[PDB]
Design a protein around this nucleic acid. Structure first.
Ligand SMILES: [Zn+2]
Ligand SMILES: [Zn+2]
Ligand SMILES: [Zn+2]
Ligand SMILES: [Zn+2]
Length: 111
DNA sequence: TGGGGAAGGGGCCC
DNA sequence: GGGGCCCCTTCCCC
């Protein structure tokens, strides 16, 4: 547990404090060597490296389809069985993604 | 109404 | 012991 001096906000993880402080500044030190695109976080750069490399480490356990990104894999999982897994309690409406539920819970104003 | 992309925080392990 | 590498979330916009 560490507290950010700039924002007085608790951040979990001893080594994660430099990452949060970088979010206040807008610096993007990590730069891809191929497309010369800068990213704020290293793990974001590695995902961009997957796009350049074309590797798909996420393989479906039901049909064997290979996808490059985790959310792409989860989208394929919803095609198999998980289509529309979110519901609105107030109005009884189904949704595909969790952000759409947040959009509905704010824009629709059922409550 | 749906999806791609990006921006953040957290857990595990070294 | 700062950090890679994975996970998760909501937001912006077409
Ligand atoms: Zn801060
Ligand atoms: Zn690149
Ligand atoms: Zn599949
Ligand atoms: Zn509703």
């Amino acid at each position: 547990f560490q507290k950010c001096p700039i924002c007085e906000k608790v951040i979990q993880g001893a080594g994660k404090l430099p990452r949060h402080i970088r979010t206040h500044t807008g610096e993007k030190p990590y730069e891809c060597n191929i497309c010369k695109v800068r990213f704020t976080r290293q793990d974001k750069l590695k995902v961009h490296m997957r796009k350049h490399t074309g590797e798909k480490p996420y393989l479906c356990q039901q049909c064997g389809a290979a996808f490059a990104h985790n959310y792409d894999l989860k989208n394929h999982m919803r095609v198999h069985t998980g289509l529309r897994p979110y519901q609105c309690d107030s109005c009884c409406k189904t949704f595909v993604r969790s952000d759409h539920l947040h959009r509905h819970l704010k824009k629709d104003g059922c409550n």
